[PDB]
Structure 1
Amino acid sequence: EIVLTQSPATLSLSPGERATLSCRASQSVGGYLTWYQHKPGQAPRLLIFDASIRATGIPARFSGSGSGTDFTLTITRLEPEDFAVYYCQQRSMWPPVTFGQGTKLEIKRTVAAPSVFIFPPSDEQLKSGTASVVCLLNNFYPREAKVQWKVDNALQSGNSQESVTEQDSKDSTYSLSSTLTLSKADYEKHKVYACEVTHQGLSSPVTKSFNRG
């Protein structure tokens, strides 16, 4: 069964620049290979099939090259409409029809450090027996960030969940939401609730905290 490996996983680039995406098959599918474009909430879009040929409506900034095992997709002069996810798909040996895990073409921007906010649980929630502490990381670039919850100096792990927005159409920023969840009984026996953020726009970790009370 053929396995496509795409690189890089995520490509950060600026418009006007050249983007080069690779797709390695585990075994010559040779000519045979498509490339697809995918924007969130949208239907995939065929770009070029049989490796080098663009379908109709697809721009010239897009060219496919390659054979058997190694393939490349070059978007030679980036428009903002291309930042999407790109997938390669094989069709020499199927089923099954395989895909790579996609490459995400994202926008390079300058480093923007996160504005951090911590939010205590509402009294209303605490009556139902649970407590949600929320830490917001607002409009930062790049995307990689690190949230570390601390309760009374103890590092928490396994009791948080996180979510990141799509890159802003206007800013090219990302924001992240982290929720630390604990029982009400636990929330009440502790005091210091802190959110430690590590990001490349900071010389050192930022910590927002509050004391219950």
Structure 2
Amino acid sequence: DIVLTQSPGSLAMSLGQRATISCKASQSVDYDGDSYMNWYQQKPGQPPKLLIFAASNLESGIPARFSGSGSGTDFTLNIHPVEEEDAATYYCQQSNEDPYTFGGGTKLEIKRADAAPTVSIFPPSSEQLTSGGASVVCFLNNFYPKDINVKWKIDGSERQNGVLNSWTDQDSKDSTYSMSSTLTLTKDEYERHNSYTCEATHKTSTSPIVKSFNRN
């Protein structure tokens, strides 16, 4: 089986710059005068979309910002004017020898200016409390870079058990990230405490961003 190795595995490029992705094949994927190296873009929740075929041909409907090069065992994909919508994972692919094989994929992050998260905390809804549960939800929205730390404090004491986090993929329009942090307790647990605090540590502030409420 022809093994395709992509490099880098992860890449961040500023808006309008050039992104370059390399694909190295264990055996040649060019045959006679033809090449069977193809490049695809996959955005979250979507099937892959063909960008380049036969290692240098621009697929119809794909902007000329995408281009490919190389032969034999070494190929490259170039994205000049990198744009916000280009945030995706990129795959090289070989159609030379059965079985067809894919590269491991290269995730492209679009660089942008720093942005502090917009943090909102939500006490459990009354309906959930009637259901016997108590989820305290904290939204940390539209921040950049993606590295962020969330601390949950209950009556001033740090809490780690019962926290579940979810991150959006990079926004295709403004290149920001968003995150939800949920502290789930039982109703009995939740009513044994007064102060609930969601603490965000991000590069845009030397002091943590604090949102809090009292059960009352």
Confirm or deny a common fold (TM above 0.5): yes
Shift of 1:166: 4.5
8 Å contact 1:6–1:100 — kept in the other structure? no
SS, match of residue 145 in structure 2: coil
Shift of 1:51: 2.1
Matches of 2:194 and 2:103, distance apart in 1: 47
1:160 aligns with 2:164: yes
Pick from 42, 62, 72 the counterpart of residue 38 of structure 1: 42
Structure 1 gap ranges (5+)? none
Give the aligned partner of residue 64 of structure 1: 68
Give the aligned partner of residue 11 of structure 1: 12
1:204 aligns with 2:170: no
Give the aligned partner of residue 21 of structure 1: 21
Any idea what the Cα deviations from partners look like across 1:116-136, whole Å, max 9, x if unmatched? 111111222111111110111
Judged with a 3 Å threshold, the aligned counterparts in structure 2 of structure 1 residues 125 and 19 are, in CA distance, closer, same or farther, namely same
1:138 aligns with 2:136: no
Give the aligned partner of residue 33 of structure 2: none
Matches of 1:12 and 1:87, distance apart in 2: 17
Which shifted more, 134-143 or 172-181?
A: 172-181
- Corresponding pairs, count: 209
Give the aligned partner of residue 74 of structure 1: 78
Shift of 1:202: 1.6
- TM-score, normalization by structure 1: 0.81
Judged with a 3 Å threshold, the aligned counterparts in structure 2 of structure 1 residues 24 and 181 are, in CA distance, closer, same or farther, namely farther
- TM-score, normalization by structure 2: 0.80
Matches of 1:8 and 1:131, distance apart in 2: 40
Matches of 1:203 and 1:165, distance apart in 2: 25
Matches of 1:198 and 1:29, distance apart in 2: 48
1:194 aligns with 2:193: no
State the superposition RMSD in angstroms: 2.6
8 Å contact 1:23–1:72 — kept in the other structure? yes
Shift of 1:19: 1.3
**Equivalent position amino acid for 2:60 in 1:** T
Matches of 1:48 and 1:147, distance apart in 2: 41
Give the aligned partner of residue 151 of structure 2: 148
Matches of 2:6 and 2:195, distance apart in 1: 45
Pick from 45, 51, 56 the counterpart of residue 55 of structure 2: 51
Pick from 102, 105, 120 the counterpart of residue 105 of structure 2: 102
| Identity across matched positions, percent | 56
